[PDB]
């Protein structure tokens, strides 16, 4: 298998504008949303049909109950942060938890919080501690580190549970997640002349595109086009150089491709 990851986010907004939820939580496998919950629906729902087909109603009912509690916990924590900072009005609180299962079988796990779009508290599961960015985060770190059972529980969740959930979801979504759609690559020429190496129709989104000169020398001043979703489940990207024999090199999912420009 290629590298894969499982992540969950929580977003809390105090005093939100009309129609905007106070709380949202979304799960992802790689770049695919798999689950969603918000303070308006108050229901955990699938975001992928392979999630809906493989998880019985008891899964969605149990996690809906957990998310209604996590939602109230997020509201209380954000109100307490605003009191610590002496902040009024609308502020944001965010959380991201997740794990990676690498190609070589090794794993990584992470848990962190943000306040108003900046890193606030970062968990270290090896030293079993919280890294605080300022004095307010230090007060919270002090309270959270006093609960040693909770730190151990989070280390087990990241290292064992998260990975077991990821393997389970990877199997449910195998036809989507473990597929390969090779790129369709072309070179176009656009008194400044540029060569554009453009790729589209590929999956997974991870791709390496570069320009080389006279075989083995990588060219300087390459511009890159972001890897973007095409909207049909595939991705597109490009690499350009200003104009010696040039070739575009593309690496995607273990396959290396060369387009020599005459």
């Amino acid at each position, epitope marked *: 298998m290629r590298t894969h990851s499982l992540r969950y986010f929580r977003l809390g907004v105090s005093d939100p504008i009309h129609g905007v939820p106070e709380f949202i939580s979304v799960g992802y496998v790689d770049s695919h949303p798999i689950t969603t919950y918000d303070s308006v629906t108050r229901q955990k729902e699938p975001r992928a049909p392979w999630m809906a087909e493989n998880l019985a109603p008891d899964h969605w009912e*149990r996690y809906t109950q957990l998310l209604r509690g996590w939602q109230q916990m997020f509201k209380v924590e954000l109100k307490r942060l605003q009191r610590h900072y002496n902040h009024s009005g609308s502020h944001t609180y965010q959380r991201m938890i997740g794990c990676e299962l690498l190609e070589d079988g090794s794993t990584t796990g992470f848990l962190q919080y943000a306040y108003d779009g900046q890193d606030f508290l970062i968990f270290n599961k090896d030293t079993l501690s919280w890294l605080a960015v300022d004095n307010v985060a230090h007060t919270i770190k002090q309270a959270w580190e006093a609960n040693q059972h909770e730190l151990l529980y989070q280390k087990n969740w990241l290292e064992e549970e998260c990975i077991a959930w990821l393997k389970r979801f990877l199997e449910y979504g195998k036809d989507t997640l473990q597929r390969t759609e090779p790129p369709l690559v072309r070179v176009n020429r656009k008194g400044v002349t540029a060569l554009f190496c453009k790729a589209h129709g590929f999956y997974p989104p991870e791709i390496y595109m570069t320009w080389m000169k006279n075989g083995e020398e990588i060219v300087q001043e390459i511009d890159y086009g972001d890897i973007l979703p095409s909207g049909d489940g595939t991705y597109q990207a490009w690499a350009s150089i200003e104009l010696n024999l040039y070739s575009c090199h593309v690496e995607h999912s273990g396959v290396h491709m060369v387009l020599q420009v005459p």
Partner: T-cell receptor
Amino acid sequence: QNIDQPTEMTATEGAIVQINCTYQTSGFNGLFWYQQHAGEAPTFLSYNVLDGLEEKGRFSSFLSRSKGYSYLLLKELQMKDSASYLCAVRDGDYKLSFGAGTTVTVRA
Amino acid sequence: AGITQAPTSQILAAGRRMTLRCTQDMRHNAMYWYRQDLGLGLRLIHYSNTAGTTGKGEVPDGYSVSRANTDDFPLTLASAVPSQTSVYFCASSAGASTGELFFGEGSRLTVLE
């Protein structure tokens, strides 16, 4: 979905008693031991979620996640240790399940 | 600061309505109701992970709960039957994913025809 512990255990005061708990659950978020004296409420004794032995006074709690196994060890048994000992597991859906409990009888 | 339940003892004729009270001032979000019977241990009836929501346990039939507020979790027997003869325990924990249970004293209920 299955928590097994012996129904009863008897040992002499001053000795040791090891209470085994085996579990089969979908996912694992920790294992708890509680003590319940006859006609009283259960009270928390220990929590284990990583592997190994945790000591707390005369009581030790061990966990092996790969074996789905824990023990509660009561050392230098006292008459006041006669009680029911409950193991409980919080599974991957955060559902807490209890075993039937082990009644420990300390012989004078 | 603790958790208390009432009544601690009751004899009830079959068919009667009965509510067991449970209150805690520890600001715990998660509350639970268990019944305890010989050879079966503690079996969850209903639970609540926070004010405003509740879920079913392992043996919910013949019972209902409400959780309008954080402090209170009443268990109702709409029409008591003899099989509901048991020892009932209410419990609370900081959250469903965090903390140990704190149990109430227990309520012994005997339902007789």
